[PDB]
Design an enzyme around this catalytic site. Sequence first.
Site, PDB file in Angstrom:
ATOM      1  NE  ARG A 240       5.612   0.304   6.147  1.00  0.00           N
ATOM      2  CZ  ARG A 240       6.196   0.934   5.140  1.00  0.00           C
ATOM      3  NH1 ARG A 240       6.106   2.249   5.053  1.00  0.00           N
ATOM      4  NH2 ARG A 240       6.869   0.257   4.229  1.00  0.00           N
ATOM      5  CB  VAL A 241      -1.211   5.642   8.110  1.00  0.00           C
ATOM      6  CG1 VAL A 241      -2.628   6.185   8.206  1.00  0.00           C
ATOM      7  CG2 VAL A 241      -0.210   6.699   8.535  1.00  0.00           C
TER       8      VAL A 241
END
Lengths: 56, 56, 126
Positions: free
Chosen positions: C114-115
């Site tokens: 996600r990052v």
Amino acid sequence: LLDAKASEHAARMTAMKNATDNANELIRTLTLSYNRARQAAITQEITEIVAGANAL
Amino acid sequence: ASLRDIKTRINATKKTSQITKAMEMVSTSKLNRAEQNAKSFVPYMEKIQEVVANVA
Amino acid sequence: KGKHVLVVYDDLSKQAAAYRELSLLLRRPPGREAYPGDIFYLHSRLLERAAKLSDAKGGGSLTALPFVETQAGDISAYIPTNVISITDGQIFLQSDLFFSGVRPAINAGLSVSRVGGAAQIKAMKK
């Protein structure tokens, strides 16, 4: 070429017949395995609940 | 394996059987139409081979 | 102190097995698969301590790389689901890819991050 096309269509038809038969045999065997798998899963669920309940 | 693996394999086999049966049903009509097309040229071939066999 | 640390945990599955042993020997009530009711609490408490401190606090960082071992690819077991739900992303390694000559065996399809995009230099982003 016309008889060649006739032979090609007949070969396709027979090959698909054989393929369908083999697929249905695979399906019956795999369902027969599915039965024992799900049965063991149910037994595990019930046993895991009941053995924890019994001792406490 | 697991019920996940067993049901995934069964679903793949089901889809493949559907595809094969559809192909077979397609092929049957093609075979019949190829036969009735091959029926058409027969008198023409007989005529031309009659003439060539006469002159042979 | 402002530094950067990389922490690697080698088997959270084995840690959870040890904690299950302790919980059962103390006769605490068991959950599913005989695991104690607070195994998720334990893992969340452990993993929520990796962070990226603000420049007020010094700017340090600590990143964690936990490992979970699965039996024949069952990612739906209790500990795998617990750890999967906590972390920011997952990397999946598969024997089918491993023995087909594809090593490292990252399944690029299932893996998520996600990052990602803010952790990549612009050249790699392009």
